[PDB]
RNA sequence: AAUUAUAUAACUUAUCUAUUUUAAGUUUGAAAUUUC
RNA sequence: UUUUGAGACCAAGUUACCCUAGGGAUUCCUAUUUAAGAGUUCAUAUCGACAAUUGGAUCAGGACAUCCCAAUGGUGUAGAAGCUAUUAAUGGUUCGUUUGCAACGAUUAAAGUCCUACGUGAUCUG
């Protein structure tokens, strides 16, 4: 049968029909990955699905009308976003309760339609009318652009507010633009505006939290608390629809949820009033995406990295190929590797968190514009980055945690992906052998990775 | 197909050969060249130039076996002769008409320069100040090569002389002139021969090497000496204003302190600092004339 | 509709015009240039130097108005100013990204060309002849080299690079228009091009000389005495001949010098290498006269 | 291999000797540590 | 230690001196293994070959983003030439040099810009 796991050493190759189970320790291709003397021992997980899982079974999910969406909204949706002909599983389950004003918590993978899951009820339900909190500035640009595009069809104004921006420059943008019904802001900048009292949340009717796990980061945890005291929150859907006593509807969207979030939600609303929806593929390995694991030293990584680039160069020379995303853990390696790429006369982009905010915004848009097909970026780009046309994700530096890998993984195999996504990760020395062992073991058992519970 | 015939050995590119992969890392990245001590030559003529100069090579990669037969295999002792794809040549070279030659990073003080320039080789040093153009650097070396400068110094920020593109710009000038790279200004006086008067062609970014408090008041009032006046009577040094930074502050201070002056070439507007190729060429030659006369 | 902004009037071009397709092939296809006899100039300061230097304008296509301010508005009065889409500009040039503007030019007349007086202040009674030049970047570097030097006059003989070829002019970056140049001079008329009896010094040690032994290079043609380059040769009006890239000087050049009383100039090179990059070959010899004449 | 490598051995300075106006450096390596 | 200032550290070989863990195999038929071709279609219903136990040369195909050829409007087109526009991939689009990113030479009605796993070649032996 077709190999579920393919390795450089064939004796350990697995067929399409074998499951070992929890008690049995699988003989992984990374089980014995210790001594560098056996160079280049690799293994790739092949693509098992030819249809996109999000697009697959769309006919088996109820129509938008069944979700309570008005036909008038559908007509605007068809003009604004004709691409979404049918709702995904997350969209089907999430939209109906939101239109009813019930507080909703959505746990689903990237590219599953989470953004549209709440935006559609958000617009129909509707001194800002809606609030969107996003951890990274890059996500703010994407959400604001998506929200603005929908707003333009509905005659609504949307603006973006990025954290780390100067208070006097922050005010300049606000005064140069008309008042926005819905505001997309980062915790750092939004906290600055609230401290200066540039905006009032008493009239806020809708609050959106994206990447709650990232939003709950200690860098933004205190800022969120300051927002909460100034934010009136609805306790029941009845109060939400009460014109005499209007309150804010809370919606939560994330891929993972740290333990204790219920206590934070309990003090704001009853635990039984929280509607929790979990994606069937949440914390599950992606079969439709190819994952490549190569044994490379830091010196040898450059050799294989360029060899992979030559393969992509050869692939482009034969047929059109999608963009390649290169992930590096540290900026110093990006600059150090970037000079090597510059030495090779290779057009590439360099992105890291500490770059100037204005410079980063232009480069991010330029990559979206397709200015350069090769992008080297750090973990700041693993969140809120558009990767529809990205064919290969190259983790030059192995991701430190599974969650980062999932965020990097979500970039490939998104809805509307023009090219089949692939994932490549490099292990310099036996530093993260356990991480590779867990991934391979889960694939053989076809189980979720341990410790991913939300 | 690797062939062993009548004492002549030449290999063929192997599937998965790591030897080729290391070439581009060595070839394209100068720090790796320093780390490994290797350089690349482009073209048969420049390749043949190194063989005549007796430069120590490392490896030859060639598309056609005819080149090996054309080349003297006796002089190919230190090179692994490997037949490679023409696609590999372009893959491993951004530029090579079927021939690629990797050579050991030569030591110019140890390089073999025969008599003909040595008869006219003087204790004259050509100094390029922050020369950031690889094309100028290689072609610049012709003037020092033809003039016969004993040794050449490049200030920090200058391009690597041993880069193949610079080798392309000079078309073998590196095998005709001794070169010292990444020379620190503090060590420049030691690099100068005894009694050397430093004469600087004066054309500015050197004002960025000054403390901000004293930046605007630290401009040296060095005497302007016309470059046509005799300066070779005793040991002398020539400084060239870089196309990017021009003449640095240290050069101006050194010339005044060393008993020299400004070997001032009036720099024509339209070229803020006389092109280092032009500034270098003019000064070196007629110094030979003055001494010959 | 012509747009009025900052006192500059520029039209909006229409993409897909067959005129662009014809020029598209002319610039990209080098042989096609010879058939049509058309040339291209790229860059705002290159164009600005050209028009100030007598270059004949035909039309200017610019992507942005900011460049037009940098263009020679004095010489744009009678020239078509059209703001075009950068895609049309990109297709024409061998360079994917021009400096936002490109222009079509007729053959400039060297007599009408106006060169900055700044080279002239350092200019010598020195004339230059180029033989069978084959590199444009060296030519632009040579003229950019000459712009730094101040060569009085340059004569380009038949078989050399088309000095008005688009990429040739780009390398000069305005230096083509800072020094006089004469194109496609026939070797028969070369002595007429120079002042008669002006001492012509031929640079000789070349690629053709590498194949030919020195002994069998003086029997059928006039014998020129070989002197070191550092020997003073500019005591009288001096003319210099420089061999083309990896080609060398021709038979007629050696005949010319002896008839005018000139001599061969010898560059002692490290044995093992004969001639380095020809780009500076003119520069190194051309300057040798420069300092001599000042003395 | 990388990293060190006052085992020794050399040179320099001491040292100890002549006259007379082992230790500290460096270098080798007996080796040491880790990797392959 | 509170505050104030504009879980291989990094790091190559080799082992037939080895140790452990295993994986394999140990002329016409006959028994395993492999499966081009047979079987209208369809390898294994029934059979069943061969076996295993380099730069180049040759020939090009296609895209239109139209260089030559071709069909046309307009003109600062009298005619013819041009110039300016539309339409059209119809067939063509040379031979070399390239002191290896570029270019020259000689021709052509023209020597468009490219794509087609170097676009495309199927020793002999171990």
Curated annotation (Swiss-Prot), chain A:
- Subunit field text: Monomer. Found in a complex with GRSF1, DHX30, FASTKD2 and FASTKD5. Associates with the 16S mitochondrial rRNA (16S mt-rRNA) and with the mitochondrial ribosome large subunit (39S).
The record's function comment reads:
Plays an essential role in facilitating the proper assembly of the mitochondrial large ribosomal subunit and its helicase activity is essential for this function. May be involved in RNA processing or transport. Has RNA and Mg(2+)-dependent ATPase activity.
Where, by residue number, is the motif Nuclear localization signal?
A: 444-447
Stretches assigned to the Helicase ATP-binding domain = 95-275
Q: Which organism is it from?
A: Mus musculus (Mouse)
Cysteine pairs forming cystine bridges in this chain are none
Give start-end ranges for motif Nuclear export signal: 116-126
Motif annotated as Q motif, chain positions: 62-92
What Gene3D superfamilies does this protein map onto? Answer: P-loop containing nucleotide triphosphate hydrolases (3.40.50.300)
The subcellular localization recorded is: Nucleus; Mitochondrion; Mitochondrion matrix, Mitochondrion nucleoid; Mitochondrion matrix
Q: Which family does it belong to?
A: Belongs to the DEAD box helicase family.
Name assigned to this protein = Probable ATP-dependent RNA helicase DDX28
Q: Which GO terms describe its molecular function?
A: ATP binding; ATP hydrolysis activity; RNA helicase activity; rRNA binding
Q: Which domain of life is it from?
A: Eukaryota
Q: Name one GO biological process term.
A: mitochondrial large ribosomal subunit assembly
Q: Which reactions appear under catalytic activity for this entry? A: ATP + H2O = ADP + phosphate + H(+)
Q: Where does ATP bind?
A: 108-115
Q: Where is this motif: DEAD?
A: 210-213
Q: Has UniProt tagged this entry with the keyword Hydrolase?
A: yes
Pfam families listed in its UniProt record: DEAD, Helicase_C
- Top-rank EC class of the record's enzyme: hydrolase
Q: Which UniProt keywords apply?
A: ATP-binding, Helicase, Hydrolase, Mitochondrion, Mitochondrion nucleoid, Nucleotide-binding, Nucleus, Ribosome biogenesis, RNA-binding, rRNA-binding
UniProtKB/Swiss-Prot annotation, chain B:
**MF GO annotations:** identical protein binding; RNA binding; rRNA (guanosine-2'-O-)-methyltransferase activity
Tell me, in one coarse class, where this protein mainly resides. Answer: mitochondrion
Which residues are listed for S-adenosyl-L-methionine binding in this entry? 241, 265, 274
Keywords on record: Methyltransferase, Mitochondrion, rRNA processing, S-adenosyl-L-methionine, Transferase, Transit peptide
Origin, by domain of life?
Eukaryota
Reaction(s) the record says it catalyses:
guanosine(1370) in 16S rRNA + S-adenosyl-L-methionine = 2'-O-methylguanosine(1370) in 16S rRNA + S-adenosyl-L-homocysteine + H(+)
Q: EC number(s) for this protein?
A: 2.1.1.-
Q: Which GO terms describe its cellular component?
A: mitochondrial matrix; mitochondrion
Its annotated compartments are: Mitochondrion
Question: Which enzyme class?
Answer: transferase
| Primary role | S-adenosyl-L-methionine-dependent 2'-O-ribose methyltransferase that catalyzes the formation of 2'-O-methylguanosine at position 1370 (Gm1370) in the 16S mitochondrial large subunit ribosomal RNA (mtLSU rRNA), a conserved modification in the peptidyl transferase domain of the mtLSU rRNA. Also required for formation of 2'-O-methyluridine at position 1369 (Um1369) mediated by MRM2.
Which protein family is it in? Belongs to the class IV-like SAM-binding methyltransferase superfamily. RNA methyltransferase TrmH family.
List the protein's name. rRNA methyltransferase 3, mitochondrial
Q: Which residues of the full protein are shown?
A: 85 to 406 of 418
């Amino acid at each position: 049968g077709p190999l579920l796991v393919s390795a450089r050493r064939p004796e350990l190759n697995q067929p399409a029909r074998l499951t070992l189970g929890r008690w049995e320790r699988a003989p992984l291709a990374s089980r014995g990955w210790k001594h560098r003397r056996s160079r280049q021992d690799h293994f790739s997980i092949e693509r098992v699905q030819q249809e996109a899982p999000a697009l697959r079974n769309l006919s088996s999910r109820g129509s938008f009308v069944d979700l309570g969406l008005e036909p008038r909204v559908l007509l605007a949706l068809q003009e604004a976003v004709p691409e979404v002909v049918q709702p995904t599983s997350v969209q089907s389950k999430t939209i109906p309760p939101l239109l009813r004003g019930r507080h909703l918590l959505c746990a689903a993978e990237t590219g599953s339609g989470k953004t549209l899951s709440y935006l559609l009820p958000l617009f129909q339900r509707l001194a800002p009318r809606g609030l969107v909190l996003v951890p990274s500035r890059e996500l703010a640009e994407q959400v604001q652009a998506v929200a603005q595009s929908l707003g333009g069809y509905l005659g609504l104004q949307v603006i973006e507010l990025g954290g780390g921006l100067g208070m006097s420059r922050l005010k300049l943008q606000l005064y140069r633009r008309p008042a926005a019904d819905v505001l997309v802001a980062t915790p750092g900048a939004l906290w600055k505006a609230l401290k200066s009292q540039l905006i009032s949340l008493q009239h806020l009717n809708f609050i959106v939290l994206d990447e709650v796990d990232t939003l709950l980061d200690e860098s933004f945890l205190e800022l969120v608390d300051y927002i909460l005291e100034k934010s009136p929150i609805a306790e029941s859907p009845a109060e939400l629809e009460d014109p005499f006593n209007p309150k804010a509807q809370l919606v939560l969207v994330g891929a993972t949820f740290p333990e204790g979030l219920n206590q934070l939600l309990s003090k704001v609303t009853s635990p039984d009033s929280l509607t929790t929806i979990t994606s069937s593929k949440l914390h599950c390995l992606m079969p439709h995406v190819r994952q490549t694991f190569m044994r490379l030293k830091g010196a040898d990584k450059v050799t294989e990295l360029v060899q992979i680039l030559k393969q992509q160069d050869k692939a482009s020379k034969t047929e059109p190929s999608g963009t390649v995303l290169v992930f590096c853990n540290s900026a110093s390696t990006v600059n150090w590797l970037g000079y090597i790429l510059d030495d090779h006369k290779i057009q590439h982009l360099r992105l890291q968190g500490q770059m100037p905010a204005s410079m980063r915004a232009g480069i991010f848009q330029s990559f979206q514009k397709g200015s350069q097909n090769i992008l080297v970026c750090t973990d700041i780009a693993s969140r809120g980055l558009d990767s529809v046309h990205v064919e290969v994700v190259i983790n030059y530096d192995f991701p430190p945690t599974l969650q980062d890998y999932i965020h990097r993984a979500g970039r490939v195999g998104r809805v509307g992906s023009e090219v089949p996504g692939s994932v490549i990760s490099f292990v310099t020395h036996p530093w993260d052998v356990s991480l590779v062992q867990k991934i391979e073991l889960a694939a053989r058992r076809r189980r979720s990775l341990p410790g991913l519970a939300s | 197909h690797t062939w062993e015939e009548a004492g002549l050995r030449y290999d063929k590119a192997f599937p998965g050969d790591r030897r080729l992969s290391s070439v581009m890392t060595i070839v394209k990245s100068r720090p790796f060249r320093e780390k490994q001590g290797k350089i690349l030559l482009e073209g048969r003529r420049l390749i043949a130039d190194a063989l005549k100069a007796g430069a120590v090579p490392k490896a030859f990669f060639f598309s056609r076996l005819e080149y090996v037969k054309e080349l003297p295999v006796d002089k190919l002792k230190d090179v692994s002769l490997i037949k490679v794809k023409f696609e590999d040549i372009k893959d491993w070279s951004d530029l090579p008409q079927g021939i690629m030659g990797i050579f050991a990073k030569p030591d110019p003080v140890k390089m073999t320069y025969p008599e003909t320039p040595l008869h006219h080789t003087l204790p004259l040093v050509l100094i390029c100040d922050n020369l950031r153009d690889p094309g100028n650097l290689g072609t610049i070396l012709r003037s020092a090569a033809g003039a016969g400068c004993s040794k050449v110094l490049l200030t920090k920020g200058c391009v690597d002389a041993w880069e193949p593109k610079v080798l392309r710009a000079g078309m073998g000038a590196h095998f005709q002139v001794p070169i010292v790279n990444n020379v620190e200004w503090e060590t420049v006086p030691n690099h100068l021969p005894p009694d050397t008067r430093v004469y600087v062609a004066d054309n500015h970014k050197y004002e960025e090497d000054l403390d901000t408090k004293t930046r605007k008041d630290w401009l040296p009032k060095l005497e302007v000496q016309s470059y046509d006046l005799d300066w070779t009577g005793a040991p002398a040094a020539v400084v060239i204003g870089g196309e990017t930074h021009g003449v640095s502050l240290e050069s101006l201070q050194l010339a005044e302190s060393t008993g020299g002056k400004r070997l001032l070439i009036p720099v024509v507007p339209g070229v803020d600092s006389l092109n280092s190729a032009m500034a270098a060429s003019i000064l070196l030659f007629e110094g030979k004339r003055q001494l010959r006369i």
